[PDB]
Scaffold this active site. Structure first.
Site, short mmCIF file in Angstrom:
data_model
loop_
_atom_site.label_atom_id
_atom_site.label_comp_id
_atom_site.label_asym_id
_atom_site.label_seq_id
_atom_site.Cartn_x
_atom_site.Cartn_y
_atom_site.Cartn_z
N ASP A 238 0.84 -1.19 0.00
CA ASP A 238 0.00 0.00 0.00
C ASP A 238 0.88 1.24 0.00
O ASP A 238 1.76 1.38 0.84
CB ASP A 238 -0.93 0.01 1.22
N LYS B 154 -3.00 6.11 -4.32
CA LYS B 154 -4.00 7.03 -3.79
C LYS B 154 -3.97 8.41 -4.44
O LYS B 154 -2.90 9.01 -4.63
CB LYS B 154 -3.82 7.21 -2.28
N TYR C 254 3.64 10.08 -0.31
CA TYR C 254 4.54 9.57 0.72
C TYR C 254 5.99 9.75 0.30
O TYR C 254 6.91 9.47 1.08
CB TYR C 254 4.30 8.09 1.00
N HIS D 255 -7.90 9.42 -1.65
CA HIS D 255 -7.21 9.41 -0.35
C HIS D 255 -8.06 9.96 0.79
O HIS D 255 -8.14 9.38 1.87
CB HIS D 255 -5.90 10.19 -0.44
#
Ligand SMILES: NC(=O)c1ccc[n+]([C@@H]2O[C@H](COP(=O)([O-])OP(=O)(O)OC[C@H]3O[C@@H](n4cnc5c(N)ncnc54)[C@H](OP(=O)(O)O)[C@@H]3O)[C@@H](O)[C@H]2O)c1
Ligand SMILES: C[C@]12CC[C@H]3[C@@H](CCC4=CC(=O)CC[C@@]43C)[C@@H]1CC[C@@H]2O
Ligand SMILES: [Cl-]
Length: 325
Positions: free
Chosen positions: A52, A86, A57, A119
């Protein structure tokens, strides 16, 4: 049913999802370069087949690198790996959805993602900024239009860029927006939300279950407890006496008890670890099971309180956490 070698569960579009995956959020500040890539490799070697991630990120390139290396050496074929990406708040504008997914594909250097999810239900000001607030610190909220954003998502699946579509941090009302939608082509197969024994998400889960939506438990071990964003009022989840007690009974850690609880009831868990031993530890959850007595007892730990309440955004029209569920 569930085993280390075989633990995929059905999604309503005919695809399937490994019931455990590796989460990959890590504080960019204090994360060594390459730690994500190394972890994804170890996870795959261990038996994980679900990763994931998210472009925001800042390590999606390491995720791709790791996945491609394992495919190149022949540890897995592409179809054996399940990657979830996402769409972030600043990219909700329909015209941006496809170029945003295409960027992630280019970063991963892959042809498609297995799952692509919205998200958060809140739209922010579009721009080179992930979290846009003004000088005074006012969160620049963009007007959300979830139905139109979802339509752009549907076109991505139609184009073959993604196998399954879902959402994250959506409440019942927000899921019904999509579910009731006029001319709905692809319903969400997944809702990714905070979930663990202090928050068994009983109502949302029953609701999702009625529509054949699978819940993915984010922060399934109770988060890394970073105060700058996590609600550190609650006592650390892995200290619970019951969970530790059950741990002793099975010679398992509190974390492994926690993970087993959620998967035993058909909830997908995506624990994050960039530590070699703990990556392995979290996967060893197929060689035992909890008794109905134990499952009920763990459920009963349900506080109905959240480690991730996102209070700094509570004044967004789409803030999901006001409703009962
Ligand atoms: N949809 C969303 O809005 C959303 C929000 C948050 C997270 N997520 C996703 O869900 C993933 C997991 O949630 P999370 O990262 O917030 O927290 P988490 O998976 O619940 O727990 C992560 C923390 O626990 C530690 N840890 C891992 N395994 C452990 C074990 N067996 N024993 C003790 N400690 C352990 C990790 O440190 P080490 O790495 O050193 O082991 C890390 O500090 C995220 O990485 C991200 O992929 C999604
Ligand atoms: C809270 C935060 C914005 C939201 C980020 C948070 C890091 C963890 C995180 C992971 C997600 O996938 C959703 C957004 C969040 C919750 C960031 C840390 C500093 C910043 O204020
Ligand atoms: Cl994004």
């Amino acid at each position: 049913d569930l085993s280390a070698a075989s633990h995929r569960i059905p999604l309503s579009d005919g695809n399937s999802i490994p019931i455990i995956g590796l989460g990959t959020y890590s504080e960019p500040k204090s994360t060594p370069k390459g730690a994500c890539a190394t972890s994804v490799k170890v996870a795959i070697d261990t038996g994980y087949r679900h990763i994931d991630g998210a472009y925001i990120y800042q390590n999606e390139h390491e995720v791709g690198e790791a996945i491609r290396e394992k495919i190149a050496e022949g540890k897995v074929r592409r179809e054996d790996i399940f990657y979830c990406g996402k769409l972030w708040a600043t990219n909700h504008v329909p015209e941006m959805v496809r170029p945003t997914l295409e960027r992630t594909l280019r970063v991963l250097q892959l042809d498609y993602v297995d799952l692509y999810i919205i998200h958060v239900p809140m739209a922010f000001k579009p721009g080179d900024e992930i979290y846009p607030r003004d000088e005074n610190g006012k969160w620049l909220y963009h007007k959300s239009n979830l139905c139109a954003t979802w339509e752009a998502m549907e076109a991505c699946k139609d184009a073959g860029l993604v196998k399954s579509l879902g959402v994250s941090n959506f409440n019942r009302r927000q899921l019904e927006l999509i579910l009731n939608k006029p001319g709905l082509k692809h319903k969400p197969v997944s809702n990714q939300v905070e979930c663990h024994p202090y928050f068994t998400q009983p109502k949302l889960l029953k609701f999702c279950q009625q529509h054949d939506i699978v819940i993915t438990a984010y922060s399934p071990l109770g988060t890394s407890r970073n105060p700058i964003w996590v609600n550190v009022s609650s006592p650390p989840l892995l200290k619970d006496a019951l969970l530790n007690s059950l741990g002793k009974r099975y010679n398992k850690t509190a974390a492994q008890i926690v993970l087993r609880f959620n998967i035993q009831r058909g909830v997908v868990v995506i624990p994050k670890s960039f530590n070699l031993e703990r990556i392995k530890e979290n996967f060893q959850i197929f060689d035992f099971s909890l008794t109905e007595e134990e499952m009920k007892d763990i459920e009963a730990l349900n506080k109905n309180v959240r480690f991730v309440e996102l209070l700094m955004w509570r004044d967004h029209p789409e803030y999901p956490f006001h409703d009962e569920y």
